[PDB]
Write a protein that binds this ligand. Structure first.
Ligand SMILES: [Mg+2]
Length: 298
């Protein structure tokens, strides 16, 4: 409600760049001494994007415990996410180890492997059923079980086997294929249709570990997805949208991972997605079918 009024005022004032910037000036600053250790240089995709020491995910095999990943633990919303960079050729083992050790059930991928003529993420999951991936270092096996390709996202069913214990888990892979970096999605509708497929799958249930979310750096598009979901869940818990302050939620998220939400436009989009998603949250069940038609999944 008041979230809507604020939105109209920022737009009628053009002050999104200012609003976004003072968010950056206010954002938490914590050390990342582990990420900056020389032995970990080749484990970071971007020199300037590192996990805080206090919230980083530790790998459990006791050689080197480092992976570029953060646990976003939203206390009030009672949802946790793991935000991580797109795996590098040499960290795909670590990535699936993290998935196993943290008991995650879903992976949300918000980037493509090639973006703007460069490799922004490694090909970390198998593309054909008959060629499984085995990660020798971490003792994990990854089979592609099935794949549902929609117009602007793809959902995949993967089998992850701990080759040590021979225990196997189903991992759901949710892959937004439509979303270039630094831009907002085309409409909130396709974005929300995707967020709500993730929600409906149970991958966000507290019975499982934290969902793993990544783009290339794991802050821009990944932060957009996480902020929208948490704001929606918050106003759902109170059934009082009036009381959700998106900026204060973003700044709480930024206590756990630097740089979440990378442009002013992504901030403005987050407002749009939450305002629109709240129509559903507050009892208009049929707006979800209405998002599905404007998404044009073919
Ligand atoms: Mg891009």
């Amino acid at each position: 409600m008041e979230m809507e009024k604020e939105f109209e005022q920022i737009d009628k004032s053009g002050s999104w760049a200012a609003i976004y910037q003072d968010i950056r000036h206010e954002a938490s600053d914590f050390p990342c001494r582990v990420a900056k250790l020389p032995k970990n240089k080749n484990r970071n995709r971007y020199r300037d994007v590192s996990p805080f020491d206090h919230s980083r995910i530790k790998l459990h095999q006791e050689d080197n415990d480092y992976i570029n990943a953060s646990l976003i633990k939203m206390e009030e919303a009672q949802r946790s996410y793991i935000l991580t960079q797109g795996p590098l050729p040499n960290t795909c083992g670590h990535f699936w180890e993290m998935v196993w050790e943290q008991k995650s059930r879903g992976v949300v991928m918000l980037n493509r492997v090639m973006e703007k003529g460069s490799l922004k993420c490694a090909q970390y999951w198998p593309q054909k059923e008959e060629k499984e991936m085995i990660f020798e270092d971490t003792n994990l096996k990854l089979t592609l079980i099935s794949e549902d390709i929609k117009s602007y996202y793809t959902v995949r069913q993967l089998e992850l086997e701990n080759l040590t214990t021979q225990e196997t888990r189903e991992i759901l892979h949710f892959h937004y294929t439509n979303w270039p970096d630094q831009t907002a999605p085309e409409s909130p509708a396709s974005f929300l249709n995707f967020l709500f497929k993730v929600r409906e799958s149970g991958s966000l249930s507290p019975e499982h570990g934290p969902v793993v979310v990544h783009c290339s750096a794991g802050i821009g598009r990944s932060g957009t997805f996480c902020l929208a979901d948490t704001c929606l869940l918050l106003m759902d818990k109170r059934k009082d949208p009036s009381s959700v302050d998106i900026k204060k939620v973003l700044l709480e998220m930024r206590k756990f991972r630097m740089g979440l939400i990378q442009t002013a436009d992504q901030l403005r989009f987050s407002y749009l997605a939450v305002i629109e998603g709240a129509k559903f949250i507050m009892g208009d069940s049929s707006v979800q079918d209405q998002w599905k038609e404007l998404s044009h999944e073919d």
